[PDB]
Amino acid sequence: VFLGFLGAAGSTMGAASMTLTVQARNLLSLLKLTVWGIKQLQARVLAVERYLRDQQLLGIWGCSGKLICCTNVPWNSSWSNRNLSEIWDNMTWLQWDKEISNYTQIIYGLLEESQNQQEKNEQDLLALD
């Protein structure tokens, strides 16, 4: 069942989490000095710049290849106190992003440091023998 790009924007987070491929596809795809040419070329560079930034974050979180990745960071209750059923079956990703947009930067920092910067050194010392 496909609704299209951003079709599940008003659905529950659990329902929207099933069609992440839909947003992933349409997320990247004599004189040429015309006002349109300058706009187009600058628009194309802006699109690949935003895409590479999100893929950069997935890279430093060790989640490059996957749309759903699990981490080692525990969920600090100060961010949100809501239970799983209330989060995934009562909220949309929009109002969720609004409730957690406040602590997103802190969470992103813990996400790159806590695991993948610790995980890689421990991976070398483990496969060291």
Binding site: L3, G4, F5, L6, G7, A8, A9, G10, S11, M13, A16, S17, L20, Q23, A24, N26, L27, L28, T34, V35, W36, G37, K39, Q40, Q42, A43, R44, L46, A47, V48, R50, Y51, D54, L58, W61, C63, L67, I68, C69, C70, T71, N72, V73, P74, W75, S80, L84, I87, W88, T92, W93, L94, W96, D97, I100, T104, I107, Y108, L111, Q115
Partner: protein, 447 residues
């Protein structure tokens, strides 16, 4: 009971953002080089995808929309890009000696004057017809030597004869990673929450029709007619009106003008008006009085919904500004018309006989408040006639200390952006933020 953050890549999350949109138009084939389509606009996809977003409710604000500000600067920049290579009429500021066209008890005048030739040393005397508005007397004492109206303020350039001024449908597209949200609420007013929202990569075919007072060739509001403003209580802010039923307007220039190609330099060519062939009639537009009276009545019904279910609603002619703001200015086949709309806004409301409007023409124009560059519209050969759709209006209250007993509405054209807002009220630009972090009972394997 142990919760852990998990990264989701592709979550339907967006935030309000302003980005650089680009052009997109169908594959229309042909004469050409029309300013807006340009040599190359990205051809529209053979099949557009409009994806309705169920359960979504987004806040809109057509008055703080940045698509309007961008389109405005795009039309202006497109105009200059088309005037740069055309012939500049700097030598056409020679002193003109003009006489009347015979007749007793004159909008156009017969002007003779000397103009340079191909060779620097040689000169030539040529006679060409002009309109009264494009010329002013160089004496006021008075004698009768005239000059062009622009020579005193700014230079002048002749619009190339190949480029056409006819608006064609243009689709404004957003780059990858961004999206456009279209409000499909029929009764959607100016701003507010739009219950029915869908997403599209490019807007519909929007024709950049430059008009004043009256909105032409626009899109018709569905269901009831819409009354959109930024502050109905504030008289200073204009009032956008959108018709549900289009009224028809016929503008013609009955004069059988002629094009006189007079070379003014090596390669440079100036196209002057050639004596008129046939009768001397002035341009004018017609509107059906039955439809306009019907359409105007439907407007007052929606007007009373904001000024009391019963109140005095009168209509008067524009009493502010001059030139562009006082006349229904527009373009038609290459000639720039300026019509008096006093016949349309001349009623009072409480509780086949087609109207005619006088239209005067100019060839020297300064559109979009442009200071420094004027353009000379070359004469169009033959008779000109264009049938257009009057879909919207642009009104304004008179203000004052009237004890709300009576309300008066006059047309106006304060800004050119209001024309773009008449077609961009339903669109909005947002950026997709596909990185979402949520807690689940999942943990990474230490392995």
């Amino acid at each position: 009971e142990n919760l852990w953050v998990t990264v989701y890549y592709g979550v339907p999350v967006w935030k309000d953002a302003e980005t650089t949109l680009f052009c997109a138009s169908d594959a229309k084939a042909y004469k050409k080089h029309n300013v807006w389509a340009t040599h190359a606009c990205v051809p529209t996809d053979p099949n557009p995808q409009e994806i309705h977003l169920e359960n979504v409710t987004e806040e809109f604000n057509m008055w703080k929309n940045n698509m309007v500000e961008q389109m405005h600067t795009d039309i202006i920049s497109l105009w200059d890009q088309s005037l740069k290579p055309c012939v500049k009429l700097t030598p056409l500021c020679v002193t003109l000696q003009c006489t009347n066209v015979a007749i007793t008890d004159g909008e156009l005048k017969n002007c003779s004057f000397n103009m340079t030739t191909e060779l620097r040393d040689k000169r030539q005397k040529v006679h060409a017809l002009f309109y009264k508005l494009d010329i002013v007397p160089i004496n006021e004492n008075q004698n009768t030597s005239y000059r062009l109206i622009n020579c005193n303020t700014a230079a002048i350039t002749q619009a190339c004869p190949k480029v056409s001024f006819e608006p064609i449908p243009i689709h404004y597209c957003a780059p990858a990673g961004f999206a456009i949200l279209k409000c499909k609420d029929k009764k959607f007013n100016g701003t507010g929450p739009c219950p029915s929202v869908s997403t599209v990569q490019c807007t519909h075919g929007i024709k950049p029709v430059v008009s004043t007072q009256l909105l032409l060739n626009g899109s018709l509001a569905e269901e009831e007619v819409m009354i959109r403003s930024e502050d109905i209580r504030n008289n200073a802010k204009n009032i956008l009106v959108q018709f549900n039923t289009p009224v028809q307007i016929n503008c013609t220039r009955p004069n059988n003008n002629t094009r006189k190609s007079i070379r003014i330099g090596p390669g440079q060519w100036f196209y002057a008006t050639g004596d008129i062939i046939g009768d001397i009639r002035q341009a004018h537009c017609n509107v059906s009085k039955a439809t306009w009276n019907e359409t105007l009545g439907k407007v007052v019904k929606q007007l009373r919904k904001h000024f009391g279910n019963n109140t005095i609603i009168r209509f008067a002619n524009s009493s502010g500004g001059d030139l562009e703001v006082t006349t229904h200015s527009f373009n038609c086949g290459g000639e720039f018309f300026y019509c008096d709309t006093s016949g349309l806004f001349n009623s009072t409301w409480i509780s086949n006989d087609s109207i005619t409007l006088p239209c005067r023409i100019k060839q020297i124009i300064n559109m979009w408040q442009r200071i420094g560059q004027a353009m000379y519209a070359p004469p169009i050969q033959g008779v000109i006639r264009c049938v257009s759709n009057i879909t919207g209006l642009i009104l304004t209250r008179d203000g004052g200390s009237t004890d709300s007993t009576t309300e008066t509405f006059r047309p106006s054209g304060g800004d050119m952006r209001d024309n773009w807002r008449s077609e961009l009220y339903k669109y909005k630009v947002v950026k997709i933020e596909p990185l979402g972090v949520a807690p689940t009972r999942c943990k990474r394997r230490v392995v």
